[PDB]
């Protein structure tokens, strides 16, 4: 009634962060800046910080949020354990959870469903990586994982292939990738798939470069989603085949301005280090604000929506949460990260992953992956 | 005289008012108070809280109720999501968390106030490799339940990188118990060597359908990860000529143990058996008690969540638990100081002879397999 208030949980640091807090502000100002006749309630994004990926800290945070009377809870973007706690408590109170980051709990299908997710599903990534491999005629491949959780993210991929030196091997880091890379070279395997965070992926590629495995005979596929902000100085060559993904639609009317803003924020904190480019999570946060506002306003056109304080100690729910879930799944939005739509289960669909390729200076798009 | 209070959290059960864990917990506390050699001057008491299965949010509240009440350790719950919620709380307030069931222990997790009596699944997996290499298998097919991830079998998935092995991964339907479609696929592909990663309940039902499809014959050899394999009814199969092999951690050859299994006795599954899940809870109360005898001065404090600071005896008490040694129902018990997990332990190798399931060797991590 009084206003669309939504909460956002940020595990982002303030200094040299990913720009999540600023991205939320930008969407809020862009939307509130558009005056309409008739006029409409102002958008508000209450911000709560998370110091650690702790289920224990997160439960306390949700308990501070419920009394505020919010329409959705966004994030966190990089705390899988906290994100599942947010999903559960959101399900109980029937306040939608807008997922913008990895969540690696199932969750069980037969629990309360109060979610949509702007982040690609594990199955989507495994399909995209398979499709690239299919493009090479399913070479012998080795998988290099930072942590064991890659068997969970890439479950669909791994169980589709026979596991052996000739087909698909799996190797994990202990933390020096040189041993692994030599074993892969001794197998004469050409195609390597790297599942890790930006910095570890950079480390595997640097050690491969030293072993001469970075020529044109090798093809790397990085599953990291921050592939565009991963800068490989003095590693990539004219010969190199290092493929990865990106969700950004650079032809979005607000993209250029979005990057200028995050560029300056980065300078006024980290004059020491150079600006890598926009993190995917910042962009998703921005799109999330638009998705929620869009659904709530469509709901308000055919119902009177009211929010009240809830509590962790009370069995109360938000009566309108269930309707808002319907209107959230019906959203069709064109954001910084491409087309946002959802299927009956709350997963993102009818979107694309741009398949990029590193070159000595910049990238080249060599095709895309769809869902339809 | 003196009294020390444990707290236990147990899931509600369809079977009756008290599940196997809870009955074993009480059974153990009673035995220890009746015993004069062990905890002679201490009398164990406890507070029990129950939660719905899959209710992680209720597990937080109940754990916090117990810490507010004053306890020295918290045993349970069993389901992973709730176990993780309680583990997080126990770590924050510095009170030991005693686990008896396996759960996915996330990599980037840094909780240190917990211990697990379930045999690390990586060690179990190495024991399964040892069986595979012994039987000289070149090809094998791993079947796992959706419920548990691929993650716990990671040692198996990595094996084809180091040994001449070809591994096919097949998933059990999550929506049903019927697996005939899967059995058909295997029978089709001549998949005669198989590893089943699933509970003994699900194994009983799977062998039943395997019998109805002529797959219980001299051609097939089945290896099972369940430690409750011996508690299966193998009458229907013991003449078909099929080979079955697995492990047992219940030290039933020890006479002091057998008598306790007997007191405890007072689908495809037999009766008059104590499950490993119940035996482990019984051993948890004992191994923790060994630590309480080395720390007679402690006194539970009423800790409040999100307010108080860690228990002032916690850090010491948790150290003693991780250093504890106990000879229990499940053989010798010892934890790894580096991760609080039970990575070192003894197994018996059991196999289907014409007479029934019998012992045919042993195994431990240090000296490997020892067939007899
Ligand atoms: C919805 O209800 C009316 C117009 O239908 C208006 O007064 C109110 O501000 C609207 N709320 C929102 C957030 O759109
Ligand atoms: C990437 O993961 C590794 C653990 O595998 C961790 O040590 C490192 O800090 C992570 N990188 C960042 C900057 O998140
Ligand atoms: C950040 O802003 C400055 C402004 O001139 C520009 O030189 C630089 O290229 C920008 N960084 C990126 C990655 O766009
Ligand atoms: C990117 O933006 C342009 C202009 O808004 C739009 O026409 C196009 O459909 C967008 N790309 C995708 C794939 O969503
Ligand atoms: C998917 O997205 C495109 C815009 O990129 C849209 O034109 C198309 O109609 C969508 N497909 C469906 C069936 O929603
Ligand atoms: C009593 O405790 C001792 C020492 O822990 C243990 O070895 C023994 O099994 C117990 N005796 C009986 C009969 O309860
Ligand atoms: C502790 O566990 C690690 C691997 O999980 C293992 O390398 C180490 O040997 C273990 N220590 C003991 C005491 O078993
Ligand atoms: C091998 O088997 C026997 C019987 O279980 C056992 O006594 C022996 O200790 C084992 N060998 C070693 C050194 O582990
Ligand atoms: Cl074979």
Q: Is B150 on the interface with A (CB under 8 A)?
A: yes
Please check whether residue A103 is in contact with residue A76, taking contact to mean a CB–CB distance below 8 angstroms: no
Give every CB contact of residue A253 below 8 A, 6+ residues apart in sequence. Answer: none
Is A300's C-beta closer than 6 angstroms to any atom of ligand 1?
A: yes
CA separation for the pair B5, B70 (Å, rounded) = 8
Ordered alpha helix ranges (H), B70-142: 80-92, 121-134
Check chain A for breaks (C–N over 2.5 Å) and list the residue before each, or none: 174
CATH 3.40.50.2300 domain locations along chain A? 1-120+247-266+278-350, 121-246+267-277+351-372
Inform me whether the C-beta atom of residue B306 falls under 8 Å from chain A C-beta atoms: yes
Cβ of B85 and A111 within 8 Å?
no
Residues B139 and B244 in one domain: yes
**A41 close to ligand 1 (CB < 6 Angstrom):** yes
Return the residue of A nearest to B106 by Cα. A149
Cβ(B338) to ligand 7 under 6 A?
yes
Q: CB distance A169–B88 less than 8 Å?
A: no
d(CA A261, CA A274): 15
Residue of A nearest to B57 (CA): A89
User: Ligand 8 centroid vs B353 CA: distance in angstroms?
Assistant: 21
Chain B hits for A165, Cβ within 8 Å: 160-161
Give the CATH number, domain containing residue B358: 3.40.50.2300
CA B131 to ligand 9 centroid distance, Å: 14
Quick one: how far is CA A248 from the chain centroid?
12
Written as one string, the DSSP assignment of B213-272 is TT-SSTT-EEEE--TTGGGB--GGGTTTT-EEEEEE-S-TTSHHHHHHHHHH----B-SS
- Which option is the CATH number for A121-246+267-277+351-372: 3.40.50.2300, 3.40.109.10, 3.90.730.10, 3.20.20.140? 3.40.50.2300
Matching CATH number, A1-120+247-266+278-350, of 3.30.70.250, 3.40.50.2300, 3.40.50.1170, 3.40.980.10: 3.40.50.2300
**Spatial distance between the Cα atoms of A71 and A298, rounded to a whole number of angstroms:** 14
Measured CA to CA, the distance from residue B115 to residue A221 in angstroms comes to 38
Question: Phi then psi for A173, rounded to 5 degrees?
Answer: -85, 145
Q: How many CB atoms lie within 10 A of CB B52?
A: 12
DSSP state, residue B109: -
Q: Chain B: residue nearest A173 by CA?
A: B158
Instruction: Measure the CA–CA gap between B208 and B215, rounded to whole angstroms.
Output: 10
Does one domain contain both B180 and B109?
no
Omega of the bond prior to B77 within 30 degrees of 0, cis? yes
Burial B133-145 (b: 16+ CB within 10 A, else e): eeeebebbbbbbe
Query: How many A from CA of B17 to the centre of ligand 1?
Result: 51
Count the domains in chain B.
Answer: 2
Q: Do B261 and B234 share a structural domain?
A: no
Question: Which is nearest to A283 in space by CA: A27, A79, A32, A36?
Answer: A27
Look-up: residue for tokens 């269930």? Answer: A322
C-beta separation of A221 from A184 below 8 A? no
B235 and B201 together in one domain:
yes
Q: Is residue B68 less than 8 Å (CB to CB) from chain A?
A: no
3-state SS assignment for residue A181: helix
Nearest-CB residue to B54 (from A89, A108, A165): A108
Closest of A102, A5, A79, A89 to residue A47, by C-alpha: A5
Q: Which helix (H) or strand (E) holds A151?
A: helix A150-153
- How many angstroms separate the CA atoms of A70 and A305, rounded? 12
Measured between CB atoms, does B165 come within 8 Å of chain A?
yes
State whether B39 and B175 are in the same domain.
no
Spatial neighbors of A237 by CB under 8 A, at least 6 apart, are A214, A215, A360
The Cα A82–Cα A13 span in angstroms is 16
Taken as a whole, chain A contains a residue count of 372
Which positions ≥6 away from B367 have C-beta within 8 Å? none
Q: Do A164 and B57 touch (CB under 8 A)?
A: no
Report how far residue A98's alpha carbon sits from residue A76's, in angstroms, rounded to the nearest whole number.
Answer: 9
Cα angle value A110/A158/B209 (rounded, 5°): 60
Do residues B186 and B203 share a domain? yes
Which atom of ligand 8 is found nearest the CA of B368? 14
Do B333 and B189 reside in the same domain of the chain?
no
The residues pairing with B97 across neighbouring beta strands, listed in sequence order, are B74, B114
Probe target for ligand 8 pocket from B359, B363, B366, B367, with the most ligand atoms within 8 Å of CB: B367
- Asked if the C-beta of B182 comes within 8 angstroms of chain A's C-beta atoms, the answer is no
Record: contact B157-A105, CB cut-off 8 A: no
B300 and B212 in one domain? Answer: no
Of A105, A159, A164, the CB nearest to B171: A159
Resolution in A: 2.9
Query: Is B154 an 8 Å CB contact of chain A?
Result: yes
Beta bridge pairs of residue B196? B143, B224
Q: Which residues of A touch B81 (CB under 8 A)?
A: 84, 88, 105
Q: Which domain holds residue B297?
A: 1-119+249-266+274-344
* Pairwise CB contact (< 8 Å): A163 & B108: no
* Helical axes A20-33 vs A280-300, angle rounded to 10°: 30
Residue nearest to atom 8 of ligand 8 (CA): B370
Protein residue with its CA nearest to atom 12 in ligand 6? B35
Q: Which residue has the tokens 């029937």?
A: A94
A16: left (phi over 0), alpha (psi -120 to 50) or beta: left
């Amino acid at each position: 009634l009084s206003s669309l208030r939504m909460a956002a949980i940020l595990d982002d640091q303030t200094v040299c962060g990913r720009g999540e807090r600023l991205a939320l502000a930008l969407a809020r100002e862009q939307i509130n800046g558009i005056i309409e006749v008739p006029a409409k309630a102002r958008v508000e994004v209450d911000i709560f910080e998370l110091q650690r990926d702790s289920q224990y800290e997160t439960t306390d945070t949700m308990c501070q949020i419920l009394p505020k009377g919010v329409v959705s809870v966004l994030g966190p973007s990089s705390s899988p354990a906290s994100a599942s706690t947010v999903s559960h408590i959101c399900g109980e109170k029937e306040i939608p959870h807008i997922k913008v980051g990895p969540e690696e709990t199932p969750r069980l299908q037969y629990l309360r469903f109060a979610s949509v997710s702007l982040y690609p599903s594990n199955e989507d990534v495994s399909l995209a990586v398979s499709r690239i491999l299919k493009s090479f005629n399913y070479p012998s491949a080795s998988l290099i994982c930072a942590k064991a959780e890659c068997l969970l993210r890439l479950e669909e991929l791994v169980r589709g292939f026979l596991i052996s030196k000739e087909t698909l091997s799996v190797r994990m880091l202990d933390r020096d990738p040189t041993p692994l890379l030599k074993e892969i070279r001794d197998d004469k395997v050409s195609t390597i798939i790297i599942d890790a965070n930006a910095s570890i992926s950079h480390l595997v590629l640097r050690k491969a470069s030293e072993l001469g495995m970075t020529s044109a005979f090798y093809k790397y596929i990085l599953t990291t989603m921050d592939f565009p902000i991963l800068h490989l100085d003095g590693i990539v060559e004219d010969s190199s085949n290092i493929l990865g993904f990106s969700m950004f639609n650079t032809s979005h009317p607000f993209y250029p301005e979005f990057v200028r803003s995050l560029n300056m924020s980065w300078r006024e904190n980290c004059e020491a280090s150079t600006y890598p480019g926009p993190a995917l999570s910042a962009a998703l946060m921005f799109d999330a604000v638009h998705v929620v506002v869009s659904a709530v306003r469509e709901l308000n056109r055919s119902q009177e929506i009211g929010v009240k304080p809830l509590a962790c100690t009370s069995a109360n729910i938000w009566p309108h949460g269930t309707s808002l879930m319907n209107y959230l799944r019906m959203v069709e939005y064109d954001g910084l990260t491409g087309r946002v739509e959802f299927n009956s289960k709350g997963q993102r669909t009818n979107y694309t992953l741009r398949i990029l390729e590193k070159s000595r200076q910049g990238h080249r798009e060599i095709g895309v992956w769809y869902s339809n | 005289t003196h009294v020390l209070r444990f707290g236990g959290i147990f899931e509600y059960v369809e079977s009756g008012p008290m599940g196997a864990e809870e009955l074993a917990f009480r059974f153990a506390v009673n035995t220890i108070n009746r015993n004069r050699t062990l905890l002679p001057n201490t009398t164990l008491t406890y507070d029990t809280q129950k939660i719905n299965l899959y209710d992680s949010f209720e597990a937080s509240k109940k754990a916090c109720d117990q810490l507010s009440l004053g306890v020295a350790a918290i045993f349970g719950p069993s389901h992973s999501s709730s176990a993780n919620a309680v583990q997080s709380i126990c770590n924050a307030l510095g009170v030991p968390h005693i686990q008896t069931r396996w759960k996915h222990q996330v990599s980037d997790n840094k909780d240190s106030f917990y211990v697990s009596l379930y045999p690390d699944f990586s060690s179990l997996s190495r024991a399964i490799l040892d069986l595979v290499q012994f039987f000289k298998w070149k090809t094998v097919t791993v079947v796992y339940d959706d419920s548990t991830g691929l993650i716990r079998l990671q040692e198996l998935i990595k094996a084809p990188s180091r040994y001449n092995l070809r591994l096919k991964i097949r998933q059990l339907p999550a929506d049903t118990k019927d697996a005939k479609p899967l059995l058909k696929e295997m029978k089709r592909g001549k998949e005669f060597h198989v590893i089943f990663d699933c509970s003994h309940e699900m194994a009983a039902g799977i062998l039943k359908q395997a019998l109805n499809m002529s797959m219980m014959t001299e051609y097939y050899h089945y290896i099972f990860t369940t430690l409750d394999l011996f508690a299966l009814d193998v009458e229907p199969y013991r003449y078909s000529g099929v080979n079955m092999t697995g492990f047992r951690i219940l030290n039933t050859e020890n006479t002091q143990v057998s008598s306790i299994i007997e007191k405890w006795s007072m689908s495809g599954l037999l009766d008059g058996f104590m499950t490993t899940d119940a035996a482990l809870m019984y051993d948890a109360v004992h191994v923790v008690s060994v630590a309480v005898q080395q720390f007679p001065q402690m006194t539970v404090s009423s800790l409040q969540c999100n307010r108080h600071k860690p228990w002032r005896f916690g850090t010491r008490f948790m150290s003693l638990i991780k250093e504890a040694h106990w000879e229990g129902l499940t053989g010798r018990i010892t934890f790894n100081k580096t991760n609080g997990l039970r990575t070192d332990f003894d197994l018996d190798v059991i196999s289907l002879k014409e007479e029934g399931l019998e012992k045919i060797g042993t195994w431990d991590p240090a000296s490997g397999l020892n067939m007899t």
